[PDB]
């Protein structure tokens, strides 16, 4: 007879209910299971009725794989899922958090902290739009973004993933969501999931909640704050996310007052689901349920019970799916987890899948492949990088000539520093590899290449990675541009109690600026100890992690555009002051939140 769930003209809620009523326990638990492409095979996907796949950081089909290679991979998995009895399409997720950043040749946008510097939500919406297109270029339908953490301590390894220490700025930047997913209809019910169709992707507000509030910025640790503080600082942007129809929410590894977020029924069910009326699906973080226990994974049976009873809908396993499925099945057969809980998880997963059009377009569109790295998107990334730059100093004394903007025509100029010609360094973490990497890892333009592309043909450009003082004094240079800063990092590898840049960095700046007027470009995920760099430099720019389009930097250095970025975080005098945020009783910054010098276009 007629099968209502397969009928594209029927309302989503009717299709969900029709399909849910047909499913076995195995088919239901399958929908709740998300696995790594690394453990996926056609038989695994078919036999376990798997609901979702992901690529973790650096999980790619081949080094340098084309958009088509990605589409073929995703479609191979989909074909297996579509061959099950009910033919429920899988959804494939990835960390597309500054562009489609795992993919070779994808446009890499500035990381979130630099976007916060722009104070430009429409720019961020446009970045969401371009990112959706590059993700769909690779056949992927689901991006684990935006990170709406409000980072309250820059010692956190993920501080660069947070738009600001100020929740109001994070709130405004939730415009990423309708960029990724499309604008919701007039009349939209807050908390319903939304994706416009096959040219958009499902978004994910993460990581719920207080991931940016942990003690001493220790990643995955305890956020110790009263309910009023949680609701005033860490929660607000989730409500903007509900209003904008975010499709999914990912749970944080962190704890709130000692309770694991992955086990917190009060917040996940009581608050997110029952108060905010969230109707999309709630996903774990990677091995998030394993980490409820200490040691992690020491009581996986408890991990499954605690997380599923808390209200999580989809588990990012991501590897040991057999153990997950077996344990969850046993809990349901034993009456420990009720069928109502399973039915709720599956209703939410199917709701997102039907809403986004996945049953109508389960396969990739080969005509989208050319969206990857498209020049228009690179032009956008270049605009964003330029807008993100914060000018901290432009002259050593109030009476010096301003150094910036620099002249494009000069006899001889010097470009120097470990970050001047290093694409990997300028992109930072979550670029190609999970932790990012060094050197030419993708298609882009380094600061050195941007300088050579910008200057008059008569300008001789000399590159020296780490010149000594005599080299500079003898070189006959008009000025120097020196780029230094942090190496790429992600998650706990970025936790850092000293916040001092690696050497050589300061030593290079001192050698260069001691011999010729210099503009220092600081590449970092966060404020770092900066007084010695300032003391040496004529001009200093905080460029954050500007991504693949290094011409964004030189657009401002050479005065094609004026500097406009403003600090989205407090710049501390000393790490012993931390945590120290705008509005604090004792607020003694080196530069306040909102500080930024300006220039005018030449
Ligand atoms: C402030 O605190 C931070 C965080 O705790 C700390 O930085 C970390 O230091 C660790 C050692 O103390 C280091 O762990 C080791 O890393 C070895 C390899 O490290 C290189 O490659 C990784 C990526 O694979 C980078 O992240 C590192 O920055 C480092 O990169 C190299 O750095 C040199 C010097 O600038 C450069 O010339 C190279 O080109 C560059 N290489 C690359 C590929 O980019 C590893 O093999 C060891 O087994 C060990 O695990 C850890 O990586 C680092 N984390 C970072 C930077 O995010 C600071 O202390 C050190 O800084 C490093 C760079 C080094 O110079 C140490 O001697 C410093 O003490 C702390 N600062 C202080 C205490 O003043
Ligand atoms: C030389 O540089 C000056 C400093 O940048 C610049 O004056 C600024 O111009 C900008 C852009 O027009 C002004 O921003 C606006 O401020 C409004 C009032 O609050 C906002 O409602 C606007 O939205 C806009 O704010 C920006 O929105 C985007 C976001 O990303 C930014 O962070 C945010 O600032 C800004 O207030 C001016 N600042 C000051 C101190 O005056 C000069 O531009 C002048 O000439 C033109 C371009 C015109 O816009 C004038 O109003 C402006 O004063 C610039 N001079 C020249 C000759 O180019
Ligand atoms: C926040 O971070 C702190 C610091 O990492 C966490 O405390 C640490 O927890 C680990 C257990 O995961 C402890 O390691 C264990 O130590 C015992 C010795 O007592 C040893 O026998 C075990 O094999 C294991 O290595 C570690 O000592 C401990 N450190 C401190 C200073 O307490 C803390 O649990 C984190 N909090 C949250 C909510 O995540
Ligand atoms: O080390 C590889 C894996 O580690 C995980 O903890 C990261 O979150 C994944 O993105 C990554 O694929
Ligand atoms: O790679 C999937 C997930 O891995 C986790 O380790 C990170 O915390 C998330 O930000 C990421 O989306």
Residue numbers in the entry: 1 to 602
Verbatim from the authors:
HvExoI folds in an (α/β)8 barrel (domain 1) and an (α/β)6 sandwich (domain 2) that at their interface cradle a 13 Å-deep pocket- or crater-shaped active site.
Here, we capitalise on the Glc product entrapment observation in native HvExoI isolated from seedlings, which renders it an archetype model to examine product/substrate dissociations/associations in a pocket-shaped active site. When we first described the HvExoI structure, we were unable to explain why the trapped Glc product remained bound in the active site and has not diffused away, and what was the implication of this unassuming observation. When we first detected the Glc product entrapment in native HvExoI, we hypothesised that the role of Glc may be linked to the pre-organised state of the active site to maintain efficient catalysis required for the growth of a plant embryo.
